[PDB]
Structure 1
Amino acid sequence: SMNPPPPETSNPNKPKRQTNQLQYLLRVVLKTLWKHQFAWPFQQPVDAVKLNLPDYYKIIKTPMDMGTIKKRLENNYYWNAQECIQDFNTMFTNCYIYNKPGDDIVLMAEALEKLFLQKINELPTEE
């Protein structure tokens, strides 16, 4: 499989809003995860052509990566903070789906997911 186009990051056909929760997700959560030692394999869509991984987009039909989440936040793609949280969960579960329990890349995603969970525990109150 060649690579698919990356997920859409702008939507001219939705209303936009900025909230405490969405700003926190960008300025705290994404930033903290981006800088983590384990983040780099998750920062851009898997380049299956470069890695020579023909089965990746045969198996992962809902790809997601931190770069896409960053762009969606910056473009006000999300109306509800849960839409963004869902994208993070898609990125972590994609790693568990493609790989196997106990794999090193899985342990990396698990550490990232634990940190993400710790940070969104502190998301500002829905206002």
Structure 2
Amino acid sequence: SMEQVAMELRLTELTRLLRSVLDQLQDKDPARIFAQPVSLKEVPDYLDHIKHPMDFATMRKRLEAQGYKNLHEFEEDFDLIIDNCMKYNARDTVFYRAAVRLRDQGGVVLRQARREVDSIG
């Protein structure tokens, strides 16, 4: 149908906007602490601690399959990255600190993204 196509154009444009959001968030992680999945070879107990691991490469695979229906689902995954880290790592670690800084800096980007998504529909 023509409607399914219109719908698919909106999802594609949302994907376009979320790809830009993802790039902006990922720039706030210049150390690349959050770039890839925590290695289960190197942290073999990780899944005993963290039940839903997340990272930027995994979000990108979902994004490129148009697997985010709305900004809320995208933000859920970004929050997992931060929240998993702040639980697994202690406060005095470079990892915890990196998550706090990503959260704080990401807030600005996510604030305007929400306005853009509501605005453009």
Q: TM-score range by the shorter chain?
A: 0.7 to 0.9
Identity between Structure 1 and Structure 2 (%)? 31
1:37 is paired with a residue of what secondary structure?
coil
Report the Cα distance in structure 2 between the residues aligned to 1:115 and 1:21, rounded to whole angstroms.
22
2:112 is paired with a residue of what secondary structure?
coil
Q: How many pairs align?
A: 109
* Structure with the largest fraction of helix: 2
Give 5+ residue unaligned stretches, structure 1.
Answer: 1-14
Q: Is residue 88 of structure 2 the alignment partner of residue 95 of structure 1?
A: no
**8 Å contact kept, 1:22–1:81:** no
Q: Among residues 84, 92, 98, which one is paired with 1:108 in the alignment?
A: 98
TM-score, structure 1 as length reference: 0.75
**8 Å contact kept, 2:50–2:88:** yes
Give 5+ residue unaligned stretches, structure 2.
Answer: 1-6
Question: In structure 2, do the counterparts of structure 1 residues 37 and 112 end up closer, same or farther at CA, with 3 Å as the change threshold?
Answer: same
Q: Among residues 33, 41, 50, which one is paired with 2:25 in the alignment?
A: 33
Q: Where in structure 1 do 4 or more consecutive aligned residues deviate above 3 Å?
A: 19-22
Structure number with higher relative contact order (C-alpha < 8 Å, ≥ 6 residues apart): 1
Cα-Cα RMSD: 2.0
